[PDB]
Structures are given as structure tokens and as C-alpha cells.
């Protein structure tokens, strides 16, 4: 379970976990311990998202997709988008 060297975990005001990287002076939602193998989005399967991505079903705005690596949000499922565009 332990973090890499010069990493701390912390809680937001709400008690949400995030990670502090003192090596690069940055914070992230992504757990460095859980760093999965990445893959081209078009190589994912059904209901599969690539590493870094999170599907948000927002009661106000509806479903959208969050990429924690690029710090981007978008509406299209990124796997379906890559598959679409590769046609």
C-alpha cells in the first residue's frame, strides 16, 4: 500500500482522496500505486475506458467523460470516438 518517495495522500474539505507529488510539485486525483497499463482507446472493449478516464453521469448535464491525464472533459465516449474516427 505505500506511496512512492515524496508523495503524500490528502483529503479535500469533503473528504475526497487526492495525491500530492512533492517530486514535481503537483497534485492529482490519480493514485500512482494504481497506475494501470495504458492502451489506445480504440483497443478498449465494451464498457471499458482507458487508464485515466472516468465516466460521469451528471444529473444536471448528463453523461460526460473526464480524462484525468490531460485534465479534459468531453461528451463523446472516448473509446467510441476513436473507433468511430478510425472508420
Amino acid at each position: 500500500d505505500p506511496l512512492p518517495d515524496n508523495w503524500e495522500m490528502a483529503y479535500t474539505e469533503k473528504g475526497e482522496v487526492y495525491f500530492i507529488d512533492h517530486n514535481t510539485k503537483t497534485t492529482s486525483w490519480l493514485d500512482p500505486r494504481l497506475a494501470k497499463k495504458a492502451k489506445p482507446p480504440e483497443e478498449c472493449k465494451e464498457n471499458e475506458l482507458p487508464y485515466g478516464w472516468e465516466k460521469i453521469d451528471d444529473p444536471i448535464y448528463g453523461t460526460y467523460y473526464v480524462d484525468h491525464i490531460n485534465r479534459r472533459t468531453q461528451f463523446e465516449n472516448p473509446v467510441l470516438e476513436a473507433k468511430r474516427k478510425l472508420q
Partner: peptide, 20 residues
């Protein structure tokens, strides 16, 4: 439209609840 903007964790340069 654009979806909701990316919500980052608290910025590094500041106080953190390091209570782990």
C-alpha cells in the same frame, strides 16, 4: 455545448489535509 470544466484537486502550493 461544452461539458462541465475539469475539476482539479487542490493546488500543490498551499495547505493540505495530509491525514493519511
Amino acid at each position: 455545448d461544452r461539458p462541465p470544466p475539469y475539476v482539479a484537486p487542490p493546488s500543490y502550493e498551499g495547505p493540505h489535509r495530509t491525514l493519511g
